[PDB]
Paper text:
GerQ is a spore coat protein known for its importance in spore germination in B. subtilis and B. cereus. GerQ has been reported to function by recruiting CwlJ, a protein responsible for hydrolyzing the cortex peptidoglycan surrounding dormant spores and essential for Ca2+-DPA induced spore germination. The spores are enveloped by a proteinaceous, self-assembled, multilayered structure known as the spore coat. GerQ assembles into a structurally stable architecture consisting of rings containing nine subunits, which stacks to form filaments.
In this study, we re-process the previous cryo-EM data and successfully determine the structure of these 8 nm filaments at a resolution of 3.3 Å. The GerQ filament exhibits an overall structure characterized by stacked layers, with each layer composed of nine GerQ subunits that form a bowl-like shape. These layers are related to each other by helical symmetry with a rise of 34.2 Å and a twist of −18.4°. Within each layer, the nine GerQ subunits are related to each other with C9 point group symmetry. The filament core in a single GerQ subunit contains residues 91-169. It comprises two α-helixes, five β-strands, and connecting loops that link these secondary structures. The bowl-like structure formed by the nine subunits features a wide opening (∼39 Å) on one side and a narrow opening (~17 Å) on the other side. Each interface is formed by two adjacent GerQ subunits, where β-strands from both GerQ subunits create a continuous antiparallel β-sheet. The subunit-to-subunit interface is further stabilized by hydrophobic interactions and π-π stackings. In contrast to the tightly packed bowl-like structure, the interactions between two adjacent layers in the GerQ filament are relatively weak.
Residue numbers in the entry:
A (entry chain J), B (entry chain H), C (entry chain G), D (entry chain F), E (entry chain E), F (entry chain D), ...: 91 to 169
Write the structure that this text describes.
Amino acid sequence: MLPIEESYIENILRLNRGKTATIYMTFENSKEWNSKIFRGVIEAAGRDHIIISDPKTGTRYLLLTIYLDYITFDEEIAY
Amino acid sequence: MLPIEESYIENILRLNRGKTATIYMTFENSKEWNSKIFRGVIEAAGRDHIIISDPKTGTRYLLLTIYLDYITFDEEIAY
Amino acid sequence: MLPIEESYIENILRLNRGKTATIYMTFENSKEWNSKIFRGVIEAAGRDHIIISDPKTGTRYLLLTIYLDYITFDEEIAY
Amino acid sequence: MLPIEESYIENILRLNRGKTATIYMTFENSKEWNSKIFRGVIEAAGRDHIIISDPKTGTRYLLLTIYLDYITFDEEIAY
Amino acid sequence: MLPIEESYIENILRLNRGKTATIYMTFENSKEWNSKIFRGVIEAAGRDHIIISDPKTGTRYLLLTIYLDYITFDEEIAY
Amino acid sequence: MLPIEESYIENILRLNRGKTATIYMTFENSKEWNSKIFRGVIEAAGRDHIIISDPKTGTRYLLLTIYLDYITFDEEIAY
Amino acid sequence: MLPIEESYIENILRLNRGKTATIYMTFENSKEWNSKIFRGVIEAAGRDHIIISDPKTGTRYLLLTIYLDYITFDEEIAY
Amino acid sequence: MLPIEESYIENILRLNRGKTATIYMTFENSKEWNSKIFRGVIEAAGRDHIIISDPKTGTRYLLLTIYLDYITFDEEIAY
Amino acid sequence: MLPIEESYIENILRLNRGKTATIYMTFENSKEWNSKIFRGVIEAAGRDHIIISDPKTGTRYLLLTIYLDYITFDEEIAY
Amino acid sequence: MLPIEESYIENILRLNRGKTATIYMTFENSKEWNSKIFRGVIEAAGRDHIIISDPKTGTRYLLLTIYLDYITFDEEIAY
Amino acid sequence: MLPIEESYIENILRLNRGKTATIYMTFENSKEWNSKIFRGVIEAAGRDHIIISDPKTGTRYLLLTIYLDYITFDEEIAY
Amino acid sequence: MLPIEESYIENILRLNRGKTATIYMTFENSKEWNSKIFRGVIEAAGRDHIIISDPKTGTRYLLLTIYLDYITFDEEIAY
Amino acid sequence: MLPIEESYIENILRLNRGKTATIYMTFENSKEWNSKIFRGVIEAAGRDHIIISDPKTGTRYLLLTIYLDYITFDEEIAY
Amino acid sequence: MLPIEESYIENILRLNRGKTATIYMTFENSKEWNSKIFRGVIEAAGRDHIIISDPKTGTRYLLLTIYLDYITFDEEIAY
Amino acid sequence: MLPIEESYIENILRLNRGKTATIYMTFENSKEWNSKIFRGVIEAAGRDHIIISDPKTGTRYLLLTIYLDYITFDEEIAY
Amino acid sequence: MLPIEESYIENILRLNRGKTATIYMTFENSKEWNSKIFRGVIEAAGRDHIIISDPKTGTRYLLLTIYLDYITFDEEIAY
Amino acid sequence: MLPIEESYIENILRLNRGKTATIYMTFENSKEWNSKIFRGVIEAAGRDHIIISDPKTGTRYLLLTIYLDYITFDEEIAY
Amino acid sequence: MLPIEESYIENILRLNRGKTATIYMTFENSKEWNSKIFRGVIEAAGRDHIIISDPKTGTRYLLLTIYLDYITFDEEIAY
């Protein structure tokens, strides 16, 4: 388990590469996509991106953590 | 009890891992989830996340402290 | 009585642990709780939280001082 | 009378502890209390608070100077 | 007359203590007092306040220069 | 004529003390005076004020350069 | 695969020059193009631009990463 | 032609003193002049002003570059 | 081709002096020109301007890169 | 009284062992204790320390003279 | 008691091996630990280290005196 | 009058023991006392201290000459 | 146990070759690694390096003592 | 006239005791007096002080040459 | 193994010519390369340089030890 | 012409007493005069001062060479 | 190959006169050229300069080693 | 060609008196001239100055080598 001094969002996202996650993300000023729900499998997350790979259709998204609001897992968040 | 110089929000959240908490959180600009009420059991809280594990359905949320507004406990806040 | 150089909000809140206080707090952008009135007994206040313990129902709130607007006491503010 | 280099708002508020003052204060984003008029007797003012003690009902307010707009005295501002 | 390097607003306000001035001031976000016109006699002005003493009723205001918009004199601005 | 390194707004305003100027100024958030047109004779301009002396009625304004938008002269801008 | 300390958005965009990408981008304040969907082939991406070359019509866009919201790939994000 | 390290807006405006220019300028928050079109002859431009001298009526404007949006020339921009 | 450390927007704009470009630009707060489409030939681009020379009518615009949103080329972006 | 050649800070601090002193001390770069006010009774002061013994709670501090700013006595500085 | 010529910080720290001390230490430029409070029992202190042995968990720290700010004892500083 | 070779600050401060002086002093990095104005009667000044004895309240300060900026006398500086 | 005259940091680090240590180190000016936590087994420490050999993955670090802040042991610091 | 080897600032300041001088001085880190303009008559200047005696009000300043920036005379600098 | 008196950084770097090393280096004040990760094979290291020869592309870097922060080896640091 | 061993700044400034010079000087930390342009006639320059005598108004400046940045002559620098 | 006692940066730069080098250099405080990439052929390097002769355009730079950060060769560093 | 022991910057600048040079110089803390580009003909360079004589307008600059960053020649650096 990570200590206090490095338990940031990106480190935990990198500890759970392969967990079915649904990311609730909200882009500040839009008219067509004001709030988005990216469901899929986290393939890899850097400190400015969360590469989500939806297996239903195969579209590997590339989100930006700046607009992230909250990630809902389903099995076990390994911290 | 923590001294004055380190009694921040995250330290107290880390002192009460295992207390039934309902977090009232508000995302700044959304159309679908402007205000959310995350009820559950705090499993672990870093300095940029609060891993809430709802036991009713099993969805382990991963919130962001930036959008936090206030946490309502029910038993005893250990500070 | 505190000198000028350390008479901040949190220090006074820490000098009155146990006074019936009603905190008028306002969250910036919400649709459901735009303004809240947290009534109760101040149990302990750090520099980023005000643990209010309502004795009517037992829900020990944990507010954030950032959103604080003003605290109405009823007996004696000890400064 | 204070010199130029220390004639700030809080210093003058501390020079007039005991003057009937009506503070016109405005909280930025509220729906229920957008503008408030706190009338009473200034008991003590630090650099982040103005402890106003209304003698009509006895509720000793604790305002925040950040939201202050202007203070109307009635007898003599001692500067 | 002040040189260029110290001809700020507060210095001139301090050079004209005793001139009938009408201060047009505007508080950013209010519903009841969005724009105010404080008419009176400038008694003393520091670097964060302008103590205006209306002689019609005797209410010695204490404004904040941050919200100042413009001061209309009537006789002679001594700079 | 001023060099490049000191040709700011206030320096030029100080080079034309005595020119009939109409200052188009706009206060950010007001309900009664959102845009103002101060016509008159520039008596003296510091780095935070433009003392305009209207000769029609004699009211010597004292504007703030922060809210300035643009100054329309009529004879000759001496730079 | 990039380490943690250089896994930014632009580096990954530069690792996938030649992948069919649809960039969902949103310009903050517009009336005609508030949200745009730039579909095409990423030719080259610096740290302030993403040169997308649509092959349907031949218009080689030049976007700005500041307004980027999220990039949807279709085959394989190489990180 | 100016090098890269000093090819700013004001330098070019100073290289074309005497070219018929129409400056499209927009003041942020106004009710009466939200967008203005200053047509005329550029007499001299410092780093915080663009002295435009309309020859049709003789009103020598003095704009502020902060509110500038774009300048439409008609003959030749000398850079 | 430019390296990573100097591949900014202005450098590329300077590498393609002479390419038919249509710049989609948006001024933040306007009522008459909220979004503009400047079509023409890029003559020269500094780090705060993009001198576009429309050959249809001859009006050599002088835009500001701050308000730039995205540039659509038509032939070949040389990076 | 000490001569000129040995009247340093530490010598005088050693001549007044037993005087109620409030030391205003400031640590250069801190986020939690940027300025501290150590009130108490000076028990002994070497050339790199000032052992202050607060009698209110009994915590015998051990400050460092390097960070000292100024000592306020209350009765008589014996030099 | 030590004479004047050798009463430095390290000598006194070596005279009190075994006193419950809380060292308030501040590292100059950090983002995660800008100010630290090392509580424990001083086991041994050289001239460049203060081996603090916390008995609560058993982690024997090894601090550096360069970053020391001030040590708060609780029983008796033997000098 | 002192010769050139010994006319330092401390010597003159020692020649005027008993003159009402207001010392304008500035501590380098503070949040609460960045600039202080110590008014009083100079009782004695060594080469690292200026014992100022305010007679209004009786608090005999002990400043440090390192942080001194300038001393304003009122009657006669004897040099 | 080392005497006073040679009890420096490097000597003690050399007396404990083989103790599980977590070194909290902070590099002065970085954007990606401002604070690092090197956990492992100290293999050998000279006077300008601390060869830490993490056994989890096998990466034998080579730190620099200049940037060291503090070393947390876990079993016994032999001095 | 002084030779090259002793024509320092203090020597010239001592050659012009009695010349109306305005000293432009700047204290490094202040919030209230960042730049000061001491106007008056130079009474005597040592090698660490410039005793300026303003005759308008009678306050005989005592500046420090370390913070000096430049002295503007008005009649004749005798060197 | 080197003795204590010559176990510096450069000597050890010279004892491991031919070990795959990743040097984490940070240049103090840059906008484009604030932190760099030079991965490769150490060919030779003097006392002011570390000639790293990346075999992936063949670019033989020449770093400066002054900016070095820490070197991560992978096989065996021979000291 | 001076040899190599004595061709310093002050010697050349002393060889051109009487040349119209504009000294571009910059004081390190100021809010009102961060950069100054002293235009005039060099009357005499020692090794710590440059007595510039502006003939337009008669104010004989006395600059300090420490803050000098560069001197622009107009006729002939005699070296 | 140079021995240990003279293997400095300048000696090696002088051993490779004629190797295509790209010098990554960073000037401490600039607004226009904060980081520069000088690509070319090293013609000659003294102990305070590196005469780089770019053959693309013919501009023979003359850098300063003080601001050097790191030199990337491409063929063979001869040490 | 100069030997190693005297190949400094000033010696080479003195070997090329008469070469068209553009000196890129940067003054540390300025608001108006943070970076300057002095183009011209080097007339003579001592060890603390570089007398550049621009022939376009005739202003013979006198720079200071301390602020020098790098000199770009155009024909041949004779070393």
